[model samples]
Target: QLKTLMLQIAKQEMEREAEERRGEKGRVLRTRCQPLELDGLGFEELQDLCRQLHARVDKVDEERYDVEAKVTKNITEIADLTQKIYDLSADAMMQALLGTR
Candidate 1:
């Protein structure tokens, strides 16, 4: 039914919104840790910090890829379900109107 499609769409929208909010929160964290632009620390200290930052970003990137995969799966499932609902509604309307008359 149309209601079902609307509900599914709403659910997907909410999930997407949540994902965006999470990304925003992550951006805030990254901004808080912005690199030392003025270079107050020694070369070795800066190198260590840079290495750690790169590791953290690598881990986050892996997790991000996983999240993206899940989102893609959900989108495919939604498309299939929407198609099925459309077909069913069409069939039901035809049957209701004709009624074996």
Candidate 2:
């Protein structure tokens, strides 16, 4: 009885997590883009498609890294600009108020 209860709780938790993930972006694509079943395909055809799929994945992964790098670079620039603006404002405020260079 205790084991059954634990199993039921686990199933419910999994279902809840699945529901939450369904709302996330790319969830539909991830769920729908599963590997094709091989039962009906010729061996050669299957091999070709598999190789093509792998190549596509490699290209996308490379692009993903490039995009991430650009995002990181832009974020760093924005932070640097923010800090410079704050520092300049502080310096100007001090000079105007206290008559100090």
Candidate 3:
């Protein structure tokens, strides 16, 4: 039983090592886009990094402006709706519409 178990364990370990080799290659590719060891980067590389950062900032800022404009439009809608609700609930307006009592 122990010899059979040892064979199984050894086979699994070799498969794990081969699997890890391919997995490691994929992991390096997956993580490659996400890093800049900034302290080690020099002139042209650093310039590229800053340009990418600026472009990201520009994209984010435009998104923020659109969201801000939407907030005001939504607020205006809410304000108008609440005013209409208030008019509907008021006794004078209700009486005028419903007529008496």
lDDT of 1 by residue, 1-101 (tens): 99999999889979988989898888787864565563587889888888988998899899889999999999999999999996979799989999986
Please give the CA lDDT of all the candidate structures.
0.87, 0.85, 0.86
Per-prediction TM-score: 0.50, 0.50, 0.47
Highest-scoring model, lDDT: 1
Off by over 4 Å in 3: 1-37, 89-101
Residue 62, model 2: lDDT of 95
Clashes of 1: 0
Which is the leading candidate under TM-score?
1
RMSD of each: 13.6, 19.1, 24.3
lDDT of 2 by residue, 1-101 (tens): 99999999989889987787677745666643665777888989998989988998899799889999999999999999998996879888998999944
TM-score of candidate 2 to 2 decimals: 0.50
- What is candidate 3's TM-score against the reference? 0.47
Task: Please count the clashing residue pairs in each candidate, in the order shown.
Answer: 0, 0, 0
Tens-digit lDDT track of model 3 for 32-70: 335657998889999998998899778979988999999
